[PDB]
Amino acid sequence: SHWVXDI
Amino acid sequence: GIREVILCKDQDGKIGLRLKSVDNGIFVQLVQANSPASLVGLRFGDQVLQINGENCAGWSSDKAHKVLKQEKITMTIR
Questions:
Q1: If you compute the radius of gyration of chain A from its CA atoms, what whole number of angstroms results?
Q2: In this complex, which of B18, B21, B23 lies closest to A6 when CB atoms are compared?
Q3: Fold topology of B1-78
Q4: Where do the coiled-coil regions begin and end (chain B)?
Q5: Domain boundaries, chain B
Q6: Which of B24, B26, B32, B52 is 20 to 30 A away from residue B62, measured at CA?
Q7: β-sheet bridge partners, residue B55
């Protein structure tokens, strides 16, 4: 239900 | 069961970790094999409780970007 970030 | 990981970016500035915000938490969604993230034992389903000593429950993407993509990163993991 929310964001995705690649680090 | 709380652990701390202290990560070092690779030669290209990357960690190999994908994080996902899903109702009431930040979780590890994918760890690239043979990355700094895999070397400190991060795995799918790990919950990230703190990033650089700050509680990150409910953080927006902007806040995470600011903190994580503004060469040491620390996370508290459950």
A1: 7
A2: B18
A3: Pdz3 Domain (2.30.42)
A4: none
A5: 1-78
A6: B32
A7: B50
